[PDB]
Symmetry: D2
Subunit: 385 residues, 4 copies
């Protein structure tokens, strides 16, 4: 039977995440956007609150939460700032591969350490020449005795220069004609390994306090015991990762949509034009209505997709719907939020212009808007074919 | 926690409704749209199958199903023909008022009959001069000893010429400055009462097999025992009704969207142009994807709204979101479906132009797209104010 | 220098077209939609008014008007009814090929006769298996001595069963590998020729009084002197035809958008809800505003495209923009027009539901919405390549 | 008849503006957005080139160009940077009032100086408490013998800290029940007048090189000879100004749309994914097509609006359509352009995220998207009423 009711435990995680988001993140999110520092103090706290690495199984000192849980928490954090929240989320991204494709030993060693200190990790797939086309990746891995030799370059890595270790997808089969399903290998690469050249901090339009860099791998030596399931099983792990990790990215976008909604509404209830409150102009109340409608829909789609995977079923279809839809409305609301503010909305002393800048990324990373329509269409047709 | 899982009981109604809709409705739907006959044989069948009057409590020989159940069923019926489904739902519409504001004697008598014979009923609010503005209604109810004299005209009444009895909203407080909450009285009126003048069958663009007529009420005598809760409680019963009754109309709209999607998909997997299957042109695959996205989103919204009211809480906000969103996407899908059929889609021998004609009403009846925004805004704003 | 000013001659054509459209077409357009007769009386009058075949050069007794002229006149006619107007427009469609690819003799004989009586003609390209893909046409033409032998079937021919003669595109080169630019031939085929089997009147959603039928060609013998420019020049003539003929189809759609706009506005200025005129609700006035905006834009795009060809330049790009855009807004306005009418809009006694049904075709024939985006994109890229 | 043909004179300004914009603006635009410096060297150049103060009559050493001319130029400038272009247009904004409501002495003095030196001016209407509602302004103008005492605050003034003189709209009628048409007076005020307190430079999301500040006016003394037409004629000069001045803002928006389109196209013809050029994915070709459609449509609308006013007729209706439509599509194109750049589009080293930040203002200044609908509606409705 249907249920849209949170558990008391969930209600508590949510309250914690909300309180920290609004009491700690909000008051400083603006300064961090301006300066573009790494929000170390915030991450630290988030760690102590147990609002990071939430998905690490209990066996490794983790909380062992589900995808539903992460979404719930990450909707709250995103509300404060998606710059900060992205830092946090990236940790889970680099961890999932391990959780779903790692052995006890690999898990214990790399997931275990995240539990002990406030360490960070990153997910390295994208390259200058390939992002959407993962099968177009050119980073190569060559087996030499008991180790692998990694040569290649990765681009746009969140937590790029702050990561303890990286999950790294490389092409292990040189045969150009080798199929995607057996041409790649997933590795755990320690950032301190000789040969990893961390690039400069890339300066983007939004999520400015987030660390995004390119990375070069020059003859990096990785022990075979850092291969995750085996040689060739790299593609499947990547794909399997997006299904658990898309819902939470959808939840971030409807956090940033909720913020926009809250700001717009509050303002409309204060500002007057032509003798009436903004909210009293039918054209504005209609915009607020439309805005509200979208947030609820998008919150509803990520819950569906998260529940699906938590139930132990493939959620590719629902996850893409969620990421596709959540990304679009966060973008729509962001722009509609500065509109409501008028001249003030375009101004940097107000909180909505930041939102409009942060929102854009949701339509690009973790599978572009267009890539999502490719997945959905393929998954959709599959039921008539 | 969350659950998007049907009960084994709900799975069975669902199967029943589906089989009925695809084996019995679909094959004749087209020929009822053309002739505009009342689908008598279909309604009888739906009654026997127990896919009608689903909300009548057990005490009066009903199934005493919830709103989640009604929705589930409706979505299956609507897939077949919303012309036929609208006939069915009109029944639930006239019944609800009776269920939420009637006494045992009233329910026993009027609800009890619905459970004995395949009888129909109708909801009479709308007038020539007022639809959206139900505070604008002018049909008067004047107290004359132990009865009320009713004078007025109702317009666009579903089942108007086929109902055994009517729920009738009338103005009982003559004072123009009287508030809505106290100026109207709800009555249950038997169609055979002298003075009720049923008009001709109205020819509309869609849902042509549905019976919708105008009704004149001159000097209609109604016993005081037919007053629903009390004089003045009219307004509240009406609004109370829309909350229970908005979700199922939404579900009807995402059934007519599912159908559109199924037809378009099947066609896209057969027709060829420029050497490729329609589904192979990225232009079309993207269109199909957006279509699936909206169906899933709309389904989720009515589910939420239904669960809410079943849980014992007022769902005005969620109900209006679902009604408004489902309504819009039904209309978008209908036209896009006609579009991937090309030239054949404009033709009467293919099933999608009916869908297009049918869909338009969803943005009008049971609270107009604009009226839905008014409600959402009001409900939304009240959480900040 | 810029000028959006009509010539006095143009002002006069317009006045004539407007007066006839509103005094003769409107009062009977509804009855013709219902019955689906051919509006013979109207066509007759239109002929006498000199509102038909407007593009026939003066040399053949024609008025020799330009594309700007046709658009202007046809915007006025379409306002009355696109069912009727389509009949008229089809004449020009079948004539253009002749005007641009025929010799003095062919022109004199077939264009000349249109000037003498109120005859009709049709354009035959589309087949059951191919519409959008003209190069996919299978009607074959085989040269036998001094004549050609035509075998094949055409579908969806406007004026199909009322045409004196037809322009007919057939594949004259059996080599499957033969290029589009030399594989087809354009013919003038007299309807009375033994072997042409006119099909039944197809029943569609809109433009119901228009004659649309499929046609079979069984060993039809056509004199070589009915070939238009020569064997192989068939494709180019077809393509060349759409460029002169798209603007006027765009003008029809913004005629049907203007009607919708006029009806919606008038109604909004009469109907009251919640004490105010519809026009006084900001949400409605905003809809009317948006509606007005679209019509002006679309009228502006067809004028650009018509002027382009009249200046003796290739207008493929502007023509597609116009047809694409005009088709979409007519559709948007049609639905927004019934919305404004409320319950009445869905009703067949009101004039907007017809409009919503008529409008859909604009997105399909004379190059689908999708096909237009293909042309535009190709023409657009061409300027950077 | 119709003409979409530029004069040989207009072709030359156009070339001049284009060359300036691509050879001088583009190369430094990026570095002015980052530093937010006033583009002094660029403005000087524009002045020498004669691409500034274009509307000043010949009598005062001007070019005495029309609105069509201004638009043509502006579109070219805006293509480069609307940050820089906005500085330029602000000049024309403060000048117009003077041109339509000033005497010879006023024009000679204040317009004459603009033609001698590369001086700037500003338009001062907007206040902290009122922007959209210019009848809501509170800066008072009190008559004191032969001068007026001005008290109030202006907000968001373009060129506010760089202008030689200001056009200043003030309330001269203290009576609250006084009509807009008689309650305001227009003044020309010299920036060096004791009492004018220019605020700090405001940091906005876009058009960062543009100077926009708040200004306090306490006990500012203005000679009666600086009153534009007469006491009370303020309102009408202001509205009169927007009509001449809306078209060019529209043109600025379709320059920033043209740029977005050019960048996206160029990129789509270089980047490869899944073995094909971005432009080769139908998904993208369709997006590109829609983009081109809107640019062409918006260009046409400002042309129409400009021609109208140049023809000597009130263009309120057309001006607002152009402002509203151009504004919207500039915003749609900016985000779609960022989209086909993928990850690089979010990065500061690529030219499209600036476009996105820049574009948002177009939906706010010079009459808000909502205010434009109000005007269109009013203008539209008045043709039936
Ligand atoms: C907020 C969080 C903070 C961090 C933010 C930053 C995070 C990021 O941006 S990471 C982003 C990385 N970039 C991407 O997301 C791009 C992803 N793009 C894709 O998903 C793919 O390229 C996609 C789905 C289009 C597939 O392309 P394609 O080349 O055709 O492979 P395809 O042929 O479909 O499949 C190959 C094999 O994989 C399998 N496969 C495909 N999809 C899936 C799936 N979803 N699940 C499982 N297996 C799959 C197939 O079954 C196939 O197997 P086999 O050989 O046995 O038949
Ligand atoms: C598929 C099925 C087949 C049949 C299909 C055909 C069925 C139909 O088409 S019937 C069409 C339905 N028509 C409509 O829904 C019209 C929409 N109209 C409305 O909902 C309302 O009039 C609406 C929302 C616009 C409000 O206008 P208004 O007249 O000003 O009432 P308002 O002043 O807001 O409220 C008056 C009182 O009602 C109360 N009220 C309002 N909404 C509610 C509610 N949801 N629950 C309880 N009370 C409510 C208010 O609290 C207020 O009370 P109080 O005095 O105690 O404070
Ligand atoms: C209101 C009026 C009443 C009547 C209403 C009813 C009227 C109708 O519906 S008639 C509708 C007929 N159906 C259509 O409109 C479908 C039209 N579809 C098309 O336009 C095309 O198929 C189209 C443009 C996609 C081209 O496809 P394609 O197969 O790739 O041909 P393509 O390779 O582009 O070109 C082949 C040759 O034609 C030329 N060509 C292509 N487009 C054009 C053009 N616009 N102008 C001139 N030449 C052209 C090419 O240059 C090429 O030449 P070459 O061999 O010398 O290099
Ligand atoms: C790119 C350039 C760089 C610089 C960029 C920065 C520039 C800027 O941002 S300045 C921003 C501009 N701000 C605006 O445009 C705000 C929009 N506000 C308005 O236009 C109006 O206030 C508007 C349309 C809402 C009307 O509200 P309202 O106060 O009620 O006036 P209203 O009552 O309608 O009319 C009052 C009188 O004015 C007259 N009026 C209205 N419009 C006009 C007009 N276009 N022409 C002449 N008279 C007019 C009416 O006729 C009426 O007169 P009367 O008494 O004789 O009958
Ligand atoms: C701030 C930021 C953080 C990021 N974090 C990470 C990270 O931690 N780890 C990581 O691995 N990556 C990360 N990414 C990269 C991100 O995953 C990619 O940018 C995204 O997948 C898009 O790929 P791309 O940039 O190569 O664009 P491209 O793939 O080149 O695409 C360009 C455009 O073409 C479209 N397109 C491409 N292929 C097709 C097709 N077949 N059909 C239709 N349209 C198509 C795309 O939609 C896009 O609009 C990050 C990027 C950014 C900007
Ligand atoms: C086939 C059919 C079946 C029906 N079945 C029933 C039934 O069984 N029982 C019954 O009682 N009624 C029924 N109705 C009537 C239906 O509920 C109304 O038509 C619908 O509520 C719209 O009201 P209206 O027709 O009066 O339009 P109006 O209320 O006159 O409104 C006209 C337009 O103005 C807009 N509008 C109105 N007020 C506002 C406002 N304040 N702000 C902004 N926009 C506004 C509306 O969106 C609409 O577009 C039926 C109608 C149809 C066509
Ligand atoms: C009332 C009516 C009157 C008509 N009058 C005439 C007439 O007088 N003369 C005449 O010759 N024809 C006429 N036509 C036919 C009309 O030209 C075609 O119906 C139209 O071109 C569409 O082709 P189709 O029906 O084959 O659809 P298809 O070409 O089969 O297309 C089906 C769907 O797929 C899409 N599609 C097809 N190819 C592609 C592609 N490569 N990329 C992306 N999407 C694609 C189309 O957009 C459409 O949505 C008429 C049609 C109608 C309905
Ligand atoms: C960079 C910049 C430069 C500027 N340059 C100048 C300049 O040179 N000179 C000058 O005088 N001003 C200038 N402006 C100010 C600009 O004109 C106003 O900000 C714009 O008119 C919006 O007014 P507002 O900010 O007061 O928003 P408000 O008027 O407060 O409105 C807030 C929101 O409510 C909506 N709204 C308001 N009234 C209604 C209504 N009746 N119905 C429906 N919706 C409504 C608006 O759409 C908006 O979304 C500038 C502003 C900026 C940001």
């Amino acid at each position: 039977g249907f249920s849209f009711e949170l558990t008391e435990q969930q209600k508590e995680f949510q309250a914690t995440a909300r309180k920290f988001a609004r009491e700690e993140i909000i008051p400083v999110a603006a300064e961090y956007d301006r300066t573009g520092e790494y929000p170390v103090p915030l991450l630290k706290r988030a760690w102590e609150l147990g609002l990071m690495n939430t998905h690490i199984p209990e066996s490794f000192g983790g909380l062992g939460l589900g995808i539903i849980d992460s979404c719930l928490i990450t909707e709250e954090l995103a509300y404060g700032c998606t710059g900060v929240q992205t830092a946090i989320e990236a940790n889970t991204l680099g961890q999932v591969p391990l959780i779903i494709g790692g052995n006890y030993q690999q898990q214990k060693k790399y997931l275990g350490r995240m539990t002990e200190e406030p360490l960070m990790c990153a997910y390295c797939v994208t390259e200058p020449g390939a992002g959407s086309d993962v099968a177009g990746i050119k980073t190569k891995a060559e087996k030499k005795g008991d180790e692998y030799i990694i040569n290649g370059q990765k681009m746009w890595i969140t937590n790029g220069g702050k990561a303890n270790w990286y999950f790294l997808l490389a092409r292990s089969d040189p045969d150009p004609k080798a199929p995607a399903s057996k041409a790649f290998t997933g590795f755990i690469v320690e950032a301190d390994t000789p040969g990893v050249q961390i690039g400069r901090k890339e300066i983007n339009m939004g999520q400015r306090c987030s660390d995004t860099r390119g990375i070069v791998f020059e003859d990096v030596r990785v022990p075979k015991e850092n291969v995750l399931t085996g040689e060739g099983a790299g593609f499947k792990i990547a794909m399997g990762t997006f299904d658990k990790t898309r819902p939470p990215v959808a939840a971030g976008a409807v956090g940033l949509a909720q913020r926009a909604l809250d700001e717009a509404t509050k303002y409309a209830l204060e500002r007057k034009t032509f003798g009436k409150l903004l909210a009293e102009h039918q054209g504005i109340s209609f915009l607020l209505a439309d805005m509200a409608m979208k947030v609820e829909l998008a919150r509803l789609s990520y819950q569906r997709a998260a529940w699906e995977i938590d139930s132990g079923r493939r959620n590719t279809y629902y996850a893409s719907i969620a990421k596709a839809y959540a990304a679009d409305i966060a973008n729509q609301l962001a722009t509609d939020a500065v509109q409501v503010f008028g001249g003030n909305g375009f101004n940097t002393e107000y909180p909505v212009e930041k939102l409009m800048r942060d929102a854009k990324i949701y339509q690009i990373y973790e599978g572009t808007a267009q890539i999502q329509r490719i997945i959905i269409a393929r998954e959709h047709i599959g039921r008539y074919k």
